[model samples]
Every structure is written in structure tokens, then in C-alpha cells.
Target chain A: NIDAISIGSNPPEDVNVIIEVPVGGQPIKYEMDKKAGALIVDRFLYTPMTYPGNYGFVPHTLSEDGDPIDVLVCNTRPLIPGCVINVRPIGVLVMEDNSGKDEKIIAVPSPHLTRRYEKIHDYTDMPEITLKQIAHFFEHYKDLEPGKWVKIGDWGDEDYARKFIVEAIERAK
Target chain B: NIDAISIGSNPPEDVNVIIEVPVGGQPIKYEMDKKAGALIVDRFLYTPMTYPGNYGFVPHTLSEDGDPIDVLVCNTRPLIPGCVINVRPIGVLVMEDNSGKDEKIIAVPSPHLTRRYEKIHDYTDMPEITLKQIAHFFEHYKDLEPGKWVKIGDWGDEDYARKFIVEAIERAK
Candidate 1:
């Protein structure tokens, strides 16, 4: 289960990174940056949607008339990076905040991916294939009474990996 | 060389599939049957920017109130069933009534994407990736000169093909 733990920061700019669990053979180095205070953990939140909406993270922007609405870009081809699925909620893992957070804060509610933007940042020029795959994956798992926890690359599903938080998906309620 | 041909029924039904050059070869079909032909092709015109303009094939649709003109829904994922290089002149292409002797016809011209419709289709539900790619593709070829022919393909050097069409892009003096 993903948790959003809040801890008080000693210094305004001071930050720290530590791994309690043993990974590989050596421990990962922990370093704190003063510039960014309190490294915010990533919280995976599937924007809950009764109706499956677009997939992936989207950032909003001003309209031509300079409206405060979110810019909605439809990437419906590959759900990996770009592309829009017809009826799928955007699968976004809430990573980082004003303060850089290492752990995921909250997996946005799922089956209700309605968090949208007038404008959103897109990493790839061709994200149709990526988006399509994302919508397909969530749709495949949405019917279970309790949401399923899923990890990208768990079963060789890489396209759905970059966008999906595996552990969060596993224990979705 | 692509030719401008006009085929309408006695009473003119909704322009469904435009089946021409269907002589055991890849036929270019443009669908214009969404709503009473009003939502499909608007008035055919000779003006490129006006109704019944120049060389014409049918167009996608718009609402009766002239809102929401969606770009044709030719799937881009897994390769759309059709080819990428489609040429549908948005002008009026009409055939004159019966004339006994050899006769000649006049043509009209204009410049603009539409005389009706707004909103340009729904962008909110589109896949972010699809939106990006379509925007990119259109932007990439936005300045294409008239009469220039570019071989379409998913993979291959687009820049090279673009350059190859430079000579053919020259309009009539």
C-alpha cells in the first residue's frame, strides 16, 4: 500500500534520501539538496473516473483567450508515451511536488480519471500507441470488485510501465 | 495525375463511400455520411475559401448549427486502414446540366479551411499523444505548396520526401 508520510524539515533547504530496504548488493547513496526543501514523495493517483478518461499525465495551459481551463491534448495511439484511448482515464503517478518527494504521495483515485488540464506536457511526439496501451490495460483490470495492484514490467508489459505505478495498482480499492 | 470527378445521385443521398478508380486497385474513399449530409460535406463550392469551390471531394462533418468540425476519424494506430496521403480539395465540384454540343466549364477558387463549423472537433477526449502527433504532422506539412505530391508512409525520411516535392509544389504562373 502507498502512503503519504509527512515529516517536519529541520532546515528550509535541507533534503535527505535514504533506503532502509536492502536492494541489489549495495545501498543507494542518500543526498539532500538545500535548494529544494523537503523532497516530496511521488503519490500515484489514478484520477478516479466513473467513465474511463484519457491516460497519462497532462498539464493545463491558458487558452487562446487566456482562459484558466486545462489544455486537453488527445494522444490516442500508443498509450506508452502519447496517443489517446477512446474511453480511458489518464493513468498518472503523482510524482514530486513543489518540494521534490521521493515516495509517491497518493495514487489518485481510479476508475474515475477525470483530472484534466487545458494544457499538458507531452514527452514524445508520437504518444498514440502509448496512450492506447494504457487505456487497454486499465480497462482490462477495472472489472475486478477490488482494484488490482499492478507493476509495469511485472509481466513484460513495458508500454504500460512508464505510466503505471505497479505497487499502487496491486492494492487498489 | 489526380483528376476531379463529380458523382451525385438523382436526389443526392448522403455521400457515403466515394468509390472511384475502383478498378481492382486501391481506391480513395472519403466518407461524408454522419448527419443528413449537412453534418458531412457542406455546400460544394468553387472557391477554396467559399461554398462550392474548386476541385472537390467530400469533407468530414459539422453540426447543423455549424459547430464542431472533427477531422476525419481515420485511425492512426496499428496503421489506419487507409493511406496517410489523401487529397480532398475542399471546393465546389459540380457538373452542369445537359448540353447538346461540345462545351467547356468554368472553375472558382478561394483559400480557407472552412466556411462553416467551429470548435474544430472535441479536443478534450482525444488522446494526448494523438493530439500531439496530429499537430506535429500538420505543422510539419503546413506550408506545403499546391500540387506537390509526397509519398506517405509510417517509417521513412519525411524530410527527404518533403524536399523531393519542392519542384512539384510550384503553382501555375
Candidate 2:
């Protein structure tokens, strides 16, 4: 049951993510290690870029790297690590790391009163500059590392994110 | 010369803060230990209340408790610790802990393109509900602690925060 995928309410309604590094904090990376049956703190990246939002990963969903799907929760504040929040999917950042698929789901904190873009269901709803920033951060984060180049593909809408999540769930199984 | 309060170009335009904990992270309190002559991690508070913004303090200024003026930098993502940011003052949360003055200046990260309130001059410029949440957080953060109560004072605008900063600077001397 622990390894099972259980997105709150319904699929694509709200996805749960375990926050790694909160907004405004250092990019401390954490990932769930199924082998150890625990969350592990990975090596820190040396890039000057900090997370633009709460960074985490979707539970029970696997990416092309054989890990859980990554997520970037956009909102006003920082969220603590290990804090699993249910957020509405807005869009997806499709990128290629080392010439392989690496996608990040963009979501907004559900039921946030003070947020500017509430119920963001597509890329058109989000500011182009914000999308650009997210892409830029991902592209250059591994710049110094040899044989590792991040290539940004495209910004996808909510439907795209939903489809990706569904596929990721299957990949996890 | 190293112990200076250089707030980028001019005072009140932007402020320099020592971020103890970044936004969306756990509330890890930090303060200047005059004896140590450096910033140190003071203590940790109870969980469930992750910071909504970058929590820090104004440099070279003293509050009523003989510490630097505390600040909650809003409207941005994760910023690394010790990253001194120049933010625009928007409002002030006049609070008192244990019957003593403990105000927090609310500000917006400078040159942000995705913020709703770009340049909030006062409390009125901010959403009433948003202001209420700020006050509510301060009021109830210590509810579980016995005999510990945080009093909520009147919400002040940019002018109010500016004046308070000036007074805090004088108090430092």
C-alpha cells in the first residue's frame, strides 16, 4: 500500500508531492529510495540557482530516469520537506537530460486565497516569463557537469500534464 | 566596515535581511549572537507552520528585544540562506510576543514580474484577506505553548514600516 499511487480525491484532480526544498531555501535534493525504503538526501548541486518554487516529486509515479515524477508547486510561501501537499496541475515542463526524457509537472497549491493565478489549467493561463524562468533554471542547473546537458523541449498544458501523470503511474508499476 | 547596513542604493527602497529560513521551509529561527560576532541558529519552533515567505532580519538594526528588525520577504521563490535581498516594503505586522514588541516588516522581492501586488505602498494596497492571514499566523503560532501569547497590533502600511525601520536603526545605536 505504501508503494501504491493514491492521488487525492481523483486522478488529475490533485496530485500529492513530497516537498524536497521549500521556496526561498537552498536546493536541497531528496528522493524516495525504494531499496532502502526511506527518503534519502542526495548530493547537492553546485549551481547558483535556487528553486523558483516548492520542489518535490509525485508519489508512486515513475519518470524516464526510473524515479518518481518531479513536481514544482507554485504559490506564495515555502513548504517544508516531507510535507505532502495536494496541488492542481497547471502545466508540464518537458525537457531532456543527457538526451533522455525529464519532465516536471507544474501545479498550484489548491485552495490558496492569496495566489495570483488560481485554477491554472493551461500554459496560456501562466505568464510566459515564469515558464521561461523555469526552463532556464533546469537548462543551466547541470551546466558545469560534464556529459550532462539539459535540453528544454516544450511547455505543455494541464491536459498534457494529466496524460503524462497517467503514463508515469503505469511506468511506476 | 564589515558590520554595515548597506541596503542597496538607498534605505526604504530595498532592505537587506539575513534569511534564517527560506520560504516554504520549516521555521528555523536564527539571530545574531553579539558575543560570537556572527549569525547563529538560535532554536527551532514547532512544526506545521511553514514560512509563507523568506523569514529574515534587517541588518545593523535593533528591535525592542535588542535584536535586528525581523522581516518576512514575500512574493518570490527559494533564496539561499545568507542571500541578502533588496525588497520593497509593502506592510508591517505589528505583533508582540510575551507582552513585548515583535514586529515583522512584510516586503516584496524587488523586480518581480509574476507578483500580484508589485509595489504595495500600504496595507490597503494588499488584499484584506491576505493581511488577515498574516495577522492570524502571528496570533496563533504560539497557541499551543502555555502562557505564551502573541498579540496582534494594527496593520501598518509602507510608510509605517519605513518609520519603524528608521526608529529601529536609531535604537540600534
Which candidate's TM-score is highest? 2
User: What lDDT does candidate 1 reach at residue B152?
Assistant: 23
lDDT of 2 at B85: 74
Q: What fraction of the true interface does each of the listed models get right, in terms of native contacts kept?
A: 0.00, 0.00
Runs off by more than 4 Å, candidate 1: A1-152, A155-173, B1-31, B38-132, B135-173
DockQ of 1: 0.01
Model 1 chain B worst lDDT run, 10 consecutive residues = B45-54
In candidate 2, what are the lDDT values of residues A46-156, reduced to their tens digit?
Answer: 788877788877777877777778888766466545445667888898887765778889987664322345547776687778778778878887776677798888778
